[PDB]
Design an enzyme around this catalytic site. Structure first.
Site, PDB file in Angstrom:
ATOM      1  N   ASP A 232       0.868  -1.185   0.000  1.00  0.00           N
ATOM      2  CA  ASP A 232       0.000   0.000   0.000  1.00  0.00           C
ATOM      3  C   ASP A 232       0.903   1.233   0.000  1.00  0.00           C
ATOM      4  O   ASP A 232       2.074   1.151   0.400  1.00  0.00           O
ATOM      5  CB  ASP A 232      -0.860   0.081   1.266  1.00  0.00           C
ATOM      6  CG  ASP A 232      -1.779  -1.116   1.457  1.00  0.00           C
ATOM      7  OD1 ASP A 232      -1.947  -1.915   0.510  1.00  0.00           O
ATOM      8  OD2 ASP A 232      -2.335  -1.246   2.580  1.00  0.00           O
ATOM      9  N   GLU A 503     -14.236  -1.327   5.169  1.00  0.00           N
ATOM     10  CA  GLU A 503     -14.500  -1.389   3.739  1.00  0.00           C
ATOM     11  C   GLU A 503     -15.927  -1.844   3.477  1.00  0.00           C
ATOM     12  O   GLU A 503     -16.329  -2.936   3.891  1.00  0.00           O
ATOM     13  CB  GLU A 503     -13.472  -2.285   3.033  1.00  0.00           C
ATOM     14  CG  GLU A 503     -12.127  -1.603   2.832  1.00  0.00           C
ATOM     15  CD  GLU A 503     -10.983  -2.579   2.815  1.00  0.00           C
ATOM     16  OE1 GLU A 503      -9.888  -2.211   2.320  1.00  0.00           O
ATOM     17  OE2 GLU A 503     -11.190  -3.712   3.305  1.00  0.00           O
ATOM     18  N   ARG A 519     -16.637  -4.682   6.362  1.00  0.00           N
ATOM     19  CA  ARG A 519     -15.606  -5.422   7.080  1.00  0.00           C
ATOM     20  C   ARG A 519     -15.365  -4.848   8.471  1.00  0.00           C
ATOM     21  O   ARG A 519     -15.334  -3.644   8.639  1.00  0.00           O
ATOM     22  CB  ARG A 519     -14.306  -5.385   6.263  1.00  0.00           C
ATOM     23  CG  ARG A 519     -13.025  -5.439   7.086  1.00  0.00           C
ATOM     24  CD  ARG A 519     -11.828  -5.093   6.246  1.00  0.00           C
ATOM     25  NE  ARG A 519     -10.599  -5.307   6.992  1.00  0.00           N
ATOM     26  CZ  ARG A 519      -9.387  -5.296   6.450  1.00  0.00           C
ATOM     27  NH1 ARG A 519      -9.255  -5.075   5.149  1.00  0.00           N
ATOM     28  NH2 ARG A 519      -8.314  -5.505   7.203  1.00  0.00           N
ATOM     29  N   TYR A 615      -9.277  -9.498  -1.448  1.00  0.00           N
ATOM     30  CA  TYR A 615     -10.236  -8.522  -1.933  1.00  0.00           C
ATOM     31  C   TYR A 615     -10.821  -9.061  -3.249  1.00  0.00           C
ATOM     32  O   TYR A 615     -10.105  -9.647  -4.063  1.00  0.00           O
ATOM     33  CB  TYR A 615      -9.563  -7.165  -2.180  1.00  0.00           C
ATOM     34  CG  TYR A 615      -9.209  -6.315  -0.965  1.00  0.00           C
ATOM     35  CD1 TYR A 615      -8.683  -6.876   0.199  1.00  0.00           C
ATOM     36  CD2 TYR A 615      -9.342  -4.938  -1.014  1.00  0.00           C
ATOM     37  CE1 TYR A 615      -8.337  -6.076   1.296  1.00  0.00           C
ATOM     38  CE2 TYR A 615      -9.002  -4.137   0.061  1.00  0.00           C
ATOM     39  CZ  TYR A 615      -8.495  -4.705   1.212  1.00  0.00           C
ATOM     40  OH  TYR A 615      -8.162  -3.886   2.266  1.00  0.00           O
TER      41      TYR A 615
END
Length: 658
Positions: A232, A503, A519, A615
């Protein structure tokens, strides 16, 4: 050329099959190639598929093997005690197990090449490692070799690494075939790729997939095009998109939705060793986490993403600053000039750079692309490249000129070192994209921009309302635009978690009724409901019967257009496991018209429970099939960093799920 061996339909039930009489003498030269079509849908924890060895006493460390683990990892061992050689190449998340209730035929191709002194593995059309040594060890040159074995390795007379599964086809060649020839070997892959190493994006790595079906039947997909490994931000990442006009059969050469040029788009092989794998591209600007929706009224397609100025990601993100100064209803983007220690400029109307300390305009300006102009002329900076040539990540100037951007490192005026959200729009359904514009702040000056939930925005079927779920600490923050994305207002909904990674993805159960699945940090997937088209939100509840991890994982969801067992239906995509991001499932819920409650009737395991799943993106295709674009690896495990082509796509029919 031709194979010097070729056998098939070997079943492996915890018992090694000897084939040394059928191979060992035909082994010749210092270059070999193994091609193997195999199936393992119930593997042991660690198991050998194929092996050459020295089985005589005193030489248990003299063997070549091809092994897999039940985490889906594949590898070779190459060991010779008398040469002092112990090679061990592998790559996690390299295999498939099951698909549509059946065993996947994996197609393994291992090339051992002494001209180039290189070992290279492929599985299912993907290259999973390619290593070069200074001292080559030919696999048939291992001293004292006396055994060729399928489904185990024979060391000192015993079976080690006993395999469960089967080998439908295996063949050996006394050559190292070129990369060109590997691509000719037909595959039986249950999946396909949209984005891949080597395509137009030039990113070795990809994360954060999204799927969307447009009114035309075109399927759109957006992705994190990540250049510096799978990290990230802080890194270098662009947002790439690609579409499909044949129900997901074929996909377009990806273009960029969002891109910076402060750093060179380089196809790098990020290092996977323990010492260097934490290397981050630290000087670059980037985008993370995109999301798509379509506006019925205008026709526009709309993409949002998080935006990071040079250096910045979530770790050092100026929590408690929006980047904007508020002056009577208006929000002006703050800037800092080189040399100053505080932010003494802003960007007013027409991009004019205005001084605050004096209230005087300057001779500086900002255009569409957040670049910097002086007297109407374009300032520039020098681009950066990265390399590992000195055995350590280096980020230096490369001699090329790009426009100076306010999100850049070398830039004269820098934006606030925090996180923002940008929107871009496509007037042609994803064939090109407009230059992005920054979204305003929603939670005050002294609060950082929120975090866009990746995947799908929501376009309410019986209006023009568009919603994009975002999150911050303590709440979900829905962004709502009733004017095709020109203006936005927020709608907070309190969640019982401080600092969660919440999320969120939405579904419209019936008109004006939106359920959001999100989530949490409790192992359980949560949800909330709106019945005024997202205006206000319920309290939080939790799905029982799906387990997540303590940190959890993004969940994606769609309302299905058709009836399943006479009830209206909803599909969830998520990992189903409490250890790690593995055991992928599509879970079907039938809606109950009495209380809009959901009965989670159907669990479909995308692959084996132990195989990775992160994901995801789901979409209902025009022909009522289901598309699933997902991360096929543990995106959380620090052991599965920097893996190419693990984001994969599959096509399912309902009956598979029920």
């Amino acid at each position: 050329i031709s194979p010097i061996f070729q056998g098939g339909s070997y079943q492996l039930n915890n018992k090694s099959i000897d084939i040394s009489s059928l191979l060992l003498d035909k082994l010749s030269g210092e270059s070999q190639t193994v091609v193997m079509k195999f199936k393992a849908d119930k593997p042991n924890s660690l198991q050998a598929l194929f092996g050459l060895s020295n089985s005589k006493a005193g030489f248990k460390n003299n063997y070549f093997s091809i092994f897999m683990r039940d985490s889906g990892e594949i590898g070779v061992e190459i060991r010779d005690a008398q040469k002092g050689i112990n090679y061990l190449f592998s790559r996690p998340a390299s295999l498939w197990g099951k698909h549509k209730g059946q065993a996947v035929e994996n197609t393994l191709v291992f090339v051992s090449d002494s001209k180039d002194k290189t070992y290279t593995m492929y599985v299912n059309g993907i290259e999973v490692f390619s290593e070069t040594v200074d001292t080559f060890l030919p696999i048939s040159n291992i001293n004292g070799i006396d055994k060729a074995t399928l489904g185990a390795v024979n060391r000192e007379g015993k079976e080690h690494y006993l395999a469960k599964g089967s080998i439908d086809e295996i063949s050996l060649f006394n050559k190292a075939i070129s990369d060109q020839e590997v691509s000719t070997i037909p595959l039986s892959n249950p999946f396909q790729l949209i984005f891949q190493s080597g395509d137009s994006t030039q990113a070795n790595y990809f994360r954060i997939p999204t799927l969307y079906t447009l009114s035309s039947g075109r399927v759109l997909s957006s992705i994190d095009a990540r250049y510096g490994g799978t990290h990230d931000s802080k890194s270098k990442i662009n947002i790439a998109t690609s579409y499909s006009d044949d129900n997901g059969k074929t996909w377009s050469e990806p273009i960029f939705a969002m891109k910076f040029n402060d750093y060179e788009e380089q196809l790098v092989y990020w290092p996977r060793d323990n010492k260097l794998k934490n290397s981050q591209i630290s000087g670059s600007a980037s985008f993370i986490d995109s999301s798509i929706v379509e506006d019925k009224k205008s026709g526009k397609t709309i993409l949002l993403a998080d935006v990071m100025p040079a250096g910045i990601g979530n770790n050092n993100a100026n929590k408690a600053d929006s980047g904007f100064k508020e002056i009577n209803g208006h929000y002006y983007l703050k800037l800092k000039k080189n040399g100053d220690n505080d932010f003494r400029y802003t960007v007013r109307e027409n991009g004019v750079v205005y001084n605050e300390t004096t209230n005087k305009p300057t001779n500086y300006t900002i255009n569409d692309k957040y670049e910097v102009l002086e007297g109407g002329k374009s300032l520039t900076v020098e681009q950066y490249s990265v390399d590992f040539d000195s055995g350590s990540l280096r980020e230096r100037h490369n001699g090329k000129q790009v426009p100076m951007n306010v999100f850049y490192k070398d830039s004269l005026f820098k934006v606030t070192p925090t996180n923002y959200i940008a929107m871009t729009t496509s007037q042609n359904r994803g064939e090109s994209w407009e230059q992005f514009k920054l979204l305003p702040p929603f939670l005050g000056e002294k609060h950082n921009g929120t975090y866009l939930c990746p995947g799908q925005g929501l376009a309410l079927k019986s209006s023009n309302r568009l919603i994009f779920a975002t999150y911050t600490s303590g709440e979900l923050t829905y962004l709502i635009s009733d004017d095709s994305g020109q203006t936005w207002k927020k709608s907070s909904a309190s969640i019982p978690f401080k600092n969660a990674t919440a999320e969120a993805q939405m579904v419209e159960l019936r008109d004006g009724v939106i359920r959001t699945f999100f989530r949490t940090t409790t192992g359980k997937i949560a949800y909330m409901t709106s019945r005024d088209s997202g205006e206000t939100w319920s309290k939080v509840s939790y799905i029982d019967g799906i387990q997540q991890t303590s940190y959890g994982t993004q969940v994606s969801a769609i309302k299905y257009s058709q009836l399943i067992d006479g009830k209206e239906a909803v599909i969830l995509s998520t990992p189903n496991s409490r250890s790690g991001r593995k055991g992928g499932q599509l879970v079907v819920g039938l809606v109950n018209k009495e209380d809009d409650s959901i009965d989670w009737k159907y669990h479909y395991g995308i692959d084996l429970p132990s195989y990775g799943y992160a994901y995801s993106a789901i979409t209902e295709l025009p022909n009522h099939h289901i598309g699933v674009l997902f991360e096929k690896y543990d995106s959380w495990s620090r052991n599965e960093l920097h893996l190419s082509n693990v984001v994969q796509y599959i096509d399912l029919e309902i009956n598979d799920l029920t």
